[PDB]
């Protein structure tokens, strides 16, 4: 199909920066396959030398060629594997980096609609399957497809009728292997489906453990798990029975060709045409040819699964984002005025925001309140240029916020979410996050200004101590303190605070309502109570998405 | 218990190997007969022996495999069921990988032993090559294998760490876009990728070295026996047909030993990972009438996390029938602990308690769980259907008319009928099918359907809606048959406590107030503080 062709072309284009490793591995592959094909013919030569009159020169020459070709085939096969696994790792690393880089720049709604496990499966497990196509599967297919033809050259070189026997024998083996592989794949699909069902059963049982223990329903869940396990065991038994039956019929057909081939070869022996070493070499070649055919068929079967995985991964990097290019505006001086005008926002999945219009000032502390189904955070989300407004526009200094520089806007307009999130690094990294390189003195200056130094100075190396993953080592008060310190350390002009009186102490509110970077900077505070009404210079309200 | 079939499987494997051994010996002796110019009777007999012996081998192998299966699967299922039952009061991949590797190891070990045995049947001198080169075949590849495995597992662990970091950034994406730090995450990913690239060169070197060592050892042996056998055939003590047998014997033995080296570390890893799982593995009176009443006498309890420190003490409340008890105050008083003790979740740390004239362990576990059913701290709905979710833990399945009556009593019948297909609608897991008030109504219906002797429903209407709380209070106040079964209201809504016949309150692990609600308000204790609040 055309899609498979362009997918394999893209895979080759991805593998292009590793051409020297590819040609070296291919050369070593040919050098290995030549000696591996050549050795049993010389073994038959040794046997033929021993059968007749004793020739020390011929025996010494044959043994020397044994030693040379043995060392050559042992050495040339090892280097090919190392080169191919190095190519595998290079392809895997390159595709991982490219996939992550293309995933970073996509819009927020794409991550909103897509579960994390769906991205994790593509990034972790499938990126392994990127590098299985050319370094491993194409190599094995090529080596099988060259060694089969070499072995068929040799057998013809031995005697033609014995090769016609093999030609007649092969298609049944090919058909049997195809049928067995298809059935095995189907049963494996059923196996993983049943395993997923059992995992869902045990997850449901362990999720409501307190409820089950209170109601005393552990026996029922145990019985359900036993039923699922019985289904899984029955499926496993079916799979293994099918595999054993395939092996039995394969060995039966193996003798069904072997005995008759031996009979015809011995008839040719008694006719005086062939010798003992030639027959032995033919026997070795026959033993190898069938196995090579089956492994070739299995690898060509794996080809399609790898190509499908390639399409699945490339669908992500081919997903076009829907965000306009920045206008690269970055004024040296910013007054900081923010004006809303008849704006409307619609979620990708419903007028959540409609007809909002206001204007903020640098020295004026503005507060927005109103439950409206806890959708008040969408105003800050729209202000941070995280979402594109469906109607109207948002303007800073009579300039649309889209035209501003992406780095400068987020280094100028800083907000803090309801739930602060940490990045599992040091406090030095997690406070100056978003900054390439700045002085530490400002970092603990802002930490002291945010009432967060209490648990910093008590911890070793100050800001260089390590916190838990996702910040889970610390508590919610530490989350709010770290978020405020991060917001203050970047020195913003438009500062947004959410749930200041709903999830944070008034000391943080007092610090953020009297700071030097908060005295004359544009501040928008959102609270779930009237604690901010008494101190707000201007207060605005909204309900059901409208003023 | 399965040895009665495992011994049969083992002897089946041995006989299958003996039967399979028929190809090379007979073809070598048959070519020697060709050189001997004998009569065709020997040739025909040898061909018949060939076919019969190996077809018996194939059938015996299939039977032995089918006997090993249907038994190892049963053992795996029983083990997983026992583990799940133990953890109730991650493994299947380990189990079936261990089974597969163990059976492969046994098969190829018996095959190699049979190979060596029939080598010793033939000329002893050609066997000596194998018996001196076997330690070189075993020791050195085992040395390289652990190095290669260590490098591979290091690479896999680093890959897992990098993927974890990337998925953490992907989950935290809104904050990243807020701070505009995509390039920082890109650099953080790139550094770990660079470390992986650094390790992978050593990994590839180890892989190449291991392949070199294995191939050179095996096929050096293959050329060594050929040279020695040629020398001995020149000496004349060994026929050429025996050499023809020995060549194929060496190929089969090399394949078997290489399978053994490739398999054994997997078996060791499997048993090492299974030992920790094996470590992780580790009667009452039945009432036949109404319970009537339950009481405690200054009972004390302790938390399982710190059993040396008591949680609360001084439990003197009595579940008087036809009356509603009350409990409110600080959460540190052990009210949840008292509710758990009333549900016989754990034995008391002190004092005494009784239920229908007997202690809680004295009554049967099924009867106690069926007659003392209570609503949880937060309502939870299982992933089954609503008709199945409202009857969890029932010893016998009752009629759907009773379920409809219970839903109507709890007011959830209309909500169930709002869903398609009535009460038989499939409910999403973790209460995602409907709202929290609907979940609380479902929990109340499930409690009512069991027809409890002492309802301990609490923490349901406090976290539910105001309308749901009003409906729950109205249902509690409208209990028929002189309130029938008693209740223990431990909800946060003190308004419903006005109907309590013998109210009570606890604070700091002990009781602090009791009596009438008006008397509690007129007091000066914790109830008076709540009234003044």
């Amino acid at each position: 199909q055309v899609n498979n062709k362009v997918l394999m072309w893209r895979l080759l284009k991805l593998s292009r920066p590793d051409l020297p490793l590819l040609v070296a591995a291919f050369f070593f592959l040919v050098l290995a396959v030549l000696g591996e094909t050549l050795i049993p013919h010389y073994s038959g030569r040794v046997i033929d030398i021993l059968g007749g009159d004793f020739d020390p020169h011929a025996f010494a020459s044959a043994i020397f060629f044994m030693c040379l070709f043995s060392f050559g085939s042992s050495l040339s096969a090892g280097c090919r594997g190392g080169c191919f696994t190095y190519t595998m790792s290079r392809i895997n690393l390159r595709i991982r980096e490219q996939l992550f880089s293309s995933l970073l720049r996509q819009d927020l709604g794409f991550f909103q609609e897509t579960k994390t496990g769906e991205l994790n499966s593509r990034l972790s497990s499938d990126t392994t399957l990127m590098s299985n196509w050319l370094p491993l599967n194409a190599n094995v297919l090529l080596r099988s497809l060259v060694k089969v033809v070499g072995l068929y050259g040799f057998m013809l070189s031995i005697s033609p009728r014995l090769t016609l026997l093999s030609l007649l024998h092969m298609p049944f083996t090919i058909a049997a292997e195809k049928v067995y592989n298809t059935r095995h794949q189907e049963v494996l699909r059923e196996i993983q489906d049943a395993v997923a069902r059992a995992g869902q059963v045990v997850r449901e049982a362990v999720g409501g453990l307190q409820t089950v223990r209170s109601f005393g329903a552990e026996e029922h869940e145990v019985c359900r798990y036993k039923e699922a396990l019985e289904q899984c065991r029955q499926l496993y038994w079916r799979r293994d029975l099918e595999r054993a039956l395939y092996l039995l019929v394969r060995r039966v057909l193996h003798l069904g060709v072997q005995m008759l081939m031996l009979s015809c070869g011995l008839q040719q022996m008694q006719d005086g045409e062939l010798t003992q070493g030639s027959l032995l070499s033919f026997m070795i070649y026959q033993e190898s040819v069938g196995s090579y055919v089956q492994t070739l068929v299995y690898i060509y079967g794996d080809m399609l699964s790898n190509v499908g995985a390639a399409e699945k991964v490339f669908s992500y990097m081919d997903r076009q984002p829907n965000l306009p290019s920045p206008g690269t505006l970055a004024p040296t001086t910013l007054q900081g005025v923010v004006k809303f005008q008849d704006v409307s926002f619609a979620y990708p999945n419903r007028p959540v925001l409609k007809g909002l219009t206001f204007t903020l000032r640098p020295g004026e502390v503005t507060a927005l309140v109103g439950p409206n189904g806890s959708g008040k955070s969408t105003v800050a989300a729209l202000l941070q240029n995280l979402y594109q407004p469906t109607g109207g526009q948002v303007l800073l200094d009579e300039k649309p916020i889209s035209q501003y520089e992406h780095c400068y806007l987020h280094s100028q307009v800083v907000s803090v979410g309801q739930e602060p999130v940490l990045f599992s690094g040091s406090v030095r990294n997690n406070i100056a996050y978003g900054l390439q390189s700045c002085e530490d003195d400002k970092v603990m200056a802002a930490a002291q200004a945010a009432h967060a130094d209490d648990f910093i100075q008590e911890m070793e190396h100050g800001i260089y101590t390590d916190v838990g993953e996702k910040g889970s080592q610390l508590a919610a008060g530490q989350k709010q303190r770290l978020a405020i310190a991060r917001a203050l350390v970047r020195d913003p002009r438009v500062l947004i605070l959410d749930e200041a009186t709903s999830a944070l102490d008034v000391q943080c509110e007092q610090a953020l309502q009297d700071w030097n970077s908060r005295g004359d900077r544009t501040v928008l505070v959102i609270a779930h109570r009237l604690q901010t009404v008494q101190r707000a210079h201007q207060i605005l309200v909204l309900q059901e998405g409208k003023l | 218990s399965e040895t009665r079939r495992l011994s049969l499987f083992l002897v089946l494997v041995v006989l299958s190997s003996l039967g399979e051994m028929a190809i090379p010996f007979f073809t070598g002796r048959l070519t020697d007969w060709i050189l001997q110019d004998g009569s065709a009777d020997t040739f025909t007999r040898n061909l018949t022996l060939m076919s019969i012996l190996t077809i018996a081998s194939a059938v015996l192998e299939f039977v032995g495999d089918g006997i090993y299966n249907n038994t190892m699967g049963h053992v795996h299922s029983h083990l997983q069921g026992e583990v799940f039952g133990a953890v109730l009061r991650d493994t299947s991949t380990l189990s079936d990988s261990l089974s597969e590797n163990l059976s492969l190891f046994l098969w190829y070990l018996v095959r190699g032993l049979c190979l060596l045995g029939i080598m010793l049947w033939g000329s002893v001198s050609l066997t000596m090559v194998t018996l001196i080169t076997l330690p070189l075949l075993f020791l050195l590849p085992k040395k390289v294998g652990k190095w290669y495995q260590l490098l591979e597992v290091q690479v896999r662990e680093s890959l897992a760490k990098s993927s974890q970091v990337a998925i953490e950034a992907l989950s935290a994406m809104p904050t990243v876009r807020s701070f505009a730090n995509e390039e920082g995450e890109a650099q953080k990913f790139r550094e770990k990728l660079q470390e992986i690239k650094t390790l992978n060169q050593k990994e590839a070197v180890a892989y190449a070295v291991n392949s070199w060592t294995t191939s050179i050892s095996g096929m050096l042996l293959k050329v060594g026996i050929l040279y020695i056998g040629g020398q001995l055939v020149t000496s004349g003590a060994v026929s050429s047909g025996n050499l023809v047998t020995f060549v194929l014997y060496q190929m089969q033995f090399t394949q078997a030993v290489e399978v053994l080296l490739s398999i054994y570390p997997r078996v060791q890893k499997a048993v090492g990972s299974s030992e920790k799982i094996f470590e992780y593995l580790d009667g009452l009176l039945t009432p036949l009438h109404l319970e009537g009443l339950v009481q405690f006498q200054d009972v004390s309890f302790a938390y399982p996390n710190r059993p040396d420190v008591l949680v609360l003490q001084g439990l003197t409340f009595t579940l008087r029938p036809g009356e509603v008890t009350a409990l409110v105050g600080p959460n540190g008083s052990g009210k949840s602990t008292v509710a758990a003790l009333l549900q016989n979740l754990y034995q008391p740390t002190g004092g005494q308690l009784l239920l229908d004239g007997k202690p809680l362990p004295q009554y049967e576990h099924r009867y106690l769980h069926r007659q003392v059913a209570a609503v949880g701290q937060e309502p939870q709905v299982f992933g089954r259907s609503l008709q199945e979710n409202i009857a969890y833990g029932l010893t016998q399945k009752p009629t759907m008319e009773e379920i409809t009556a219970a839903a109507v009593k709890s007011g959830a019948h209309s909500f169930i009928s709002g869903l398609p297909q009535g009460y038989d609608t499939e409910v999403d897991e973790a209460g995602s099918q409907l709202s929290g008030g609907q979940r609380q109504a479902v929990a109340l219906a499930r409690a009512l359907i069991r027809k409890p002797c002492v309802l301990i429903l609490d923490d349901a209407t406090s976290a539910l809606d105001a309308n749901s709380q009003l409906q729950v209070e109205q249902l509690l106040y409208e209990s028929p048959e002189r309130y029938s079964r008693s209740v223990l209201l431990i909800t946060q809504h003190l308004s419903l406590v006005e109907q309590a016949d013998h109210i009570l309150f606890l604070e700091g692990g002990a009781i602090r107030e009791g009596g009438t609600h008006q008397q509690l308000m007129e007091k000066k204790g914790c109830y008076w503080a709540m009234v003044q609040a």
């Binding site: 090919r80 594997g81 191919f84 696994t85 595998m88 370094p135 491993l136 190599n139 094995v140 595999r243 054993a244 092996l247 492994t295 690898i299 | 192998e61 495999d65 059976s103 492969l104 098969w107 190829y108 892989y207 392949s211 399978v259 490739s262 398999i263």
Partner: peptide
């Protein structure tokens, strides 16, 4: 049963 696998 027989072991079978592919090498790089």
């Amino acid at each position: 049963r027989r072991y079978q696998s592919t090498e790089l």
